[PDB]
Design a protein around this ligand. Structure first.
Ligand SMILES: *[C@@H](C)[C@H]1/C(=C/c2[nH]c(/C=C3N=C(/C=C4\NC(=O)C(CC)=C4C)C(C)=C\3CCC(=O)O)c(CCC(=O)O)c2C)NC(=O)[C@@H]1C
Lengths: 162, 172, 162, 172, 162, 172, 162, 172, 162, 172, 172, 162
């Protein structure tokens, strides 16, 4: 999967080149980000359960029809509510993974590639998920570089959905 | 390929799990030693041509059969391929040191290499000997206390050795 | 030209992607490196004339025949001596450029690509230049990251010649 | 392409010149504003989908003829291509901001674009309007004082503005 | 544009072949269909305005929130309602074109290619349009082959949206 | 591939034989049911998206392990590939119905599928279950007396079911 | 092999598409054609021996040297006559197969592809076969669409030979 | 390419209009005389080799310079090419007749042809003469009252002549 | 055009190499052959008119229908006879060219490439020309290397026709 | 590929050996018979179409099952492929005769051919028979005493025979 | 390409003519000078590296602006390309000498070279000077009276010069 | 391996053609030259021992530092002198092979391809070998065509090193 380190390697490999100070800079940039990145992953994982259920309720509030309209695509049943909270938890977990590797790789590999097909087939609205992601961004309680980084991946998912 | 961080994430996702506070500490330790890792990559890389040439020279000296007329390393074309292979293995080993994972080495260099040599009639065991000579030269260069802030790089040197050994074992 | 920044941009462009935190990291690495990189360039530039002359003398001493034997490829004539210190200055200058951009790019584009053809055609020995480069490394007077970086480019050149 | 550093090197090499102390200071200065520059890139990028959609929406409101049947933006395929162009221009502009040089935007995006539109019958001036709309939106988002360490990004905003103007100017 | 006739020609052309009885059969099949197809195109054209407005109302009844929620993507403004009725009119008009040429060609070329991008960017739900399409199917008043053919194109569009 | 007509011809040529008056009668039968056959193709096709979605939903509900983290259908890419496979099989089945012959389905879809799934670790038994759910839904829609001239489609339905069964057996 | 049905499927498959009303028309055209197509195939097979013998004699009559000149390529021996009626029988049988599938496919796959190499290698004149084929046309006693179709395949073979 | 139906649709879409009840009647006309059209395509196609051969013979008889040594149609390679061109134009004309629109001919055959000829030194005026000969023969074959249900095909022959005239005028 | 010398050059050029003693040997062979080849070309030319008309007569004897049957492809008319002697003269002239350059290149470039198409289109039998070629071989009066080479080209044409 | 000269060199190199005064004598002997060798090549090549045609005719006369409907040589495509194969083998044999070495024949013609025929269901023993007929005809033409300077080519015909036999044994 | 014999044939065929007297007996004359022609090719070729290096050294000595920073021959990649072109022109000239016709040189080397240099900013004028220097060296080597049977090679040297002059003219 | 004969065959093969008089002329050239070439190969193998030894000494005389300077790449040791004499023997043996096949083939396959990599890695100077090769040419004691051919292979190697 793509990370700043594997990208640096792939670029060198494709040219048949040993690493140079170019890739050293990539690594020093990576190592600079890692501390706050790993801190973001830690804190998000501790708030994950609460964030996911809190975000789900924020979606229900903005799109109140999703808890009353009949259909397997809706959270008008307990099954649907549980699916929804599960999905939001997936987005959060992916964000932590991106913080751990320093890039969108994990989010891409596990969630974004194919997401459009899923939402089309199961009649789920991208807007629902955008509102969930916005709530997470408002309520993660991170600050500094940890927040800037976490938000970059949250906003990347939002861009993917819109 | 994976680096050290990606490896952990892939293992976690298959369990639907957040990365543990424990796994995090481990990644923190790697980051803490990151500068040492980059010095090692720099130093081995900055001596890549000499490490290859010296290791090859010593190999052919120990095994004159390789370069004797009829030997696998005889003729300019075969000698060049041989020197290329030495440099390729060294190159992929440095990628492994850099990314902190052996996947790049296994996937793009070592996979199918034994089979390849076997079919060519290239003596894997001799290649392994060459790789081991490169390993010893590389660690001596990487761990030279001259001209670098003094610290303990023993863990890193152990890890570096493990990549060279993986390469040697894949063809021996 | 290849630099950590153009390489980051090129990687994203090939994938049709907006830049992300991955490329942010590359830039932070670049910016962390640039202070000492630029310092090395300035200091080398100031010592360039002296390093080049001193390097050519180190070569003459290591390979005395080079100032003895007749031939357009040798430094037995004034013209030959001038070509030699000119060539050595080119290497030093390329090293400064590599320090300015944070990569081997300038060295590759201007000097290394085609160097084999040149040495073959004009009957110049790579080992003369390796000796010159060793002298520059032993005499530039740089310390810390400045020296590590400048030396990485010098050693890169030595590798390409051997 | 060139970034800001490479641009100065290429100009020096054609003169056989060392980079001057004063050119070095200029580079040191952009380096000193590096994190501001990176915040700008991140902010604009993080809003790419909205900047495109909002600018397109306002463009179509201003020029209904674009979306009337027979218009250049009418039919889903043409609308999609139009949105894609808006996003492409934005993307290459952010590459320019990131690299501190216009070359990427010039070489891979703007070059031959006015001619392409002329051939197709796509109204270049209309694209210029859409780009101007993205500029205003992007700069407003990049220069937002909330949520960032307080400081002066005025030189950066002017540079950013210049990249959008260049794009706009290429198809106007 | 794809039609049964252009596809037959395209297949022959790519093989460098003159037309044969294979292509004659294609055309006979086309000419058998074309009369009921043109009848459907004409019937739809006469009812288009009524069907579009009725379809829009059916959407609002299914999804009342599309007439109350604030946002340019909704029909909670006259401008928004006009956009919606326009859009449904487009669909209806594409169906008549399909009936005129005997295939999905026109719908593909003018509407389906790029629709997913439009719906993503402008935040419109495919489900709104599926409901509108079901209304036109239930109200066009066609029968025999005219209905069968018209419905195949309507259902093709529903398939594209789900 | 063969259609029904071409299948007869190829078996005749290898014998140097003219098509028998008997085989002609059997082809004449297929022609007489031709409109019913096209109604079936149109009907199944016109419900393709729902047939796939409904069958997949039911499958995942019965076999939650498929979608739990680590499961074959877990992650968006894998879910999408799974849904794609369902749509693919449905599509090739309709080709067989249209052509009156299974060659298209066997040749371009079923050939090597079992072994593909083996190598990926995709559970073929589960795919077979998904295929059977599509089969029942497809025949249900195909054989609905509402909205079509009344008549007996029983032989066609038995033929349709055989193509679905062949698909399921290929991966079961 | 090619038929109107397999060509429709192939076109759709190459595009990753489900069948649509386009291919439905192809099939109706096929089914419209097949009744007269099958009748042609039936009648021809019943008159095949008489037609082949009659056509061979037509050839011998148009080109008398074919029964006089010695050489394995000629019909001056019994073996040669037998080869010749056999070949014409092949042509007739292929025409029936085309009538069965509604296209040139069988004649292409079994006879026309490579026919050039055979005639060159064994020194057989295409004009002999053109004359045979003209006899078949003038004597099959077909009428209506059955004739138009069978004649199309015969004329196709003539074109391939000329 | 467009056939007659698609051409009308594209003209209608660019104005956002349902096809005019008038336009519907004109397309319904082509449909009404479809059997005649297909007789014309069948007959012309069925005599393609003869049409090309006889037209080429006639051309060379009238213009011996083409086949004299040094002539554009002298040498086997150039003669074969010349015959090929004649067959290509006839084939594309039949495509136009079948589809009831000239676009296939213009787009895939005539576009760039005059320029190709000028560059090679092939006399387009001569190609135009050969095409006219193919025309007169094709219409003679297509419009022969023997062996077909008697009726009026005059409007169709006029359309057919128009396509051939299009091709000749493009290189004349 | 193919000749020993252009083939030698082509081979060197495709490998980006200067000529070597290999191509020197090619030229020596060509040069030693040329004397006998140019003599064959001269002698054939001097007998060209006699050979073509004699050859034509030979074809008429072997295939008498060729001067009796009505048809534009036959030599029943003076016009047809004139075409026939012209064609045969073309074959002879190409043979002289092959002798001039020491290879089949002229005959390939000017006559063999596309000959199948010509004979098919105009209903001309390859066997007629094979007989003409057999006459030329038996009557050119050449001896030694001149005959062996000339015959090599005649047989090359015969092979191409059969 | 090797010619006779190159074969000797390749055997010497692997031994680091100079070509012996004896091996030179041998090569000298081959050069001495060089013109006889070239007559044989010219003579066989000059009758290539007849050799293939007559051998093919004889094969099918002896094994009618090959051309009966359903037979491997039945149908124009398969007949054409069969004739082609005959021509291909004859061509590669002449290559071997000309270079004085079988390597070209082994490497580019015979290697894998048996397996190919097995996959196809093509009867290799029948191919062997066709190849032997070509052999008989080739040697008869190459060894005709008429119209050549009289001399002994017995050794040459044996060598020629060995290349045909090597081909026949490969497919049998 | 043509060699001298082929050029004559093509001129003859365009007139439908047998080889003329002025063309015949003449060609015999070129054949008679064949060994001298091959001496020239061998001598020039055998000194190709020196001819390129010496001519390049003299060009740069005469025109120092070419190798000063900013010159077209400055930087290793440009120097290397420059030496390559010189080698390439010399190579193609030797092909012309060997084949006795300029077509190889014109078709594969010179055609569009002037235009290429104009696009790159390469000074054609300077290339012509280098080519002139190779010409002089090549002719001196080819026409060296030592180590060869003496005779008149003046016509040959004149032909060789004309090929060099054509190449210089094409770029000047 | 490339030789006049295999290249004649290779050309014919890639075009799918039988050999013709063109390739006969190639072989005639080969067979004529072979006498001289084989003679050259025999004579060289007899002088090889003392030529290799004499050539090494010529290199030491031209390049005195080669026996004084310390280092594995020099002949300042016995092991170095032995390597050097061996190498030169390699060149001489390849030249005999070239004379045997009538081309540069053996020399390319076994020595020239990869030689640049060998000289770079082991820091051996091409000029050393050019000097050895000149010695071989001036002292091999061959005359006439034998010498001309052997010299062309020697000069080929010189060109490759320069
Ligand atoms: C055994 C195959 C038969 C045979 C051969 C034979 N040939 C010669 C002599 C020559 N053969 C040639 C061949 C060619 N000359 C050409 O110009 C061409 C193509 C244009 C070819 C293929 C030549 C030039 C000669 C020398 C002159 C001559 O014609 O004699 C001999 C004589 C001995 C020798 O090696 O020269 C023999 C024996 N002879 C037979 O009896 C076998 C039937």
């Amino acid at each position: 999967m793509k990370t700043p380190l594997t990208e640096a390697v792939s670029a060198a490999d494709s040219q048949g080149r040993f690493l140079s100070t170019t890739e050293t800079q990539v690594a020093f940039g990576r190592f600079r980000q890692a501390t706050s990145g790993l801190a973001a992953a830690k804190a998000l994982s501790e708030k994950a359960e609460s964030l996911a259920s809190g975000a789900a309720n924020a979606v229900y509030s903005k799109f109140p029809y999703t808890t009353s309209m009949t259909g397997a695509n809706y959270a008008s049943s307990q099954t649907g509510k549980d699916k929804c909270v599960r999905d939001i938890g997936y987005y959060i977990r992916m964000v932590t993974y991106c913080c751990v590797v320093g890039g969108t790789g994990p989010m891409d590999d596990y969630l974004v590639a194919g997401i459009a097909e899923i939402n089309r087939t199961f009649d789920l609205s991208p807007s629902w998920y955008v509102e969930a992601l916005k709530y997470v961004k408002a309520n993660h309680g991170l600050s500094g570089d940890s927040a800037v980084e976490a938000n970059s991946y949250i906003d990347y998912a939002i861009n993917a959905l819109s | 390929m994976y680096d050290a961080f990606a490896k952990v994430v892939s293992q976690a996702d298959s369990r639907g799990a957040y990365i543990s506070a424990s796994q995090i500490d481990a990644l923190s330790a790697m980051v803490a030693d990151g500068s040492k890792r980059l010095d090692a990559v720099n130093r081995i890389t900055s001596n890549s041509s000499a490490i290859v040439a010296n290791a090859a020279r010593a190999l052919f000296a120990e095994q004159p059969a390789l370069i004797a007329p009829g030997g696998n390393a005889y003729t300019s074309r075969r000698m060049a391929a041989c020197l290329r292979d030495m440099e390729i293995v060294l190159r992929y080993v440095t990628y492994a040191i850099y990314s902190g994972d052996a996947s790049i080495l296994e996937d793009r260099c070592l996979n199918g290499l034994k089979e390849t040599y076997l079919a060519l009639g290239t003596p894997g065991s001799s290649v392994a000997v060459g790789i081991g000579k490169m390993k010893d030269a590389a660690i001596a260069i990487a761990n030279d206390p001259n001209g670098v802030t003094r610290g303990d790089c023993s863990a890193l040197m152990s890890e570096i050795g493990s990549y060279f050994d993986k390469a040697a074992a894949a063809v021996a």
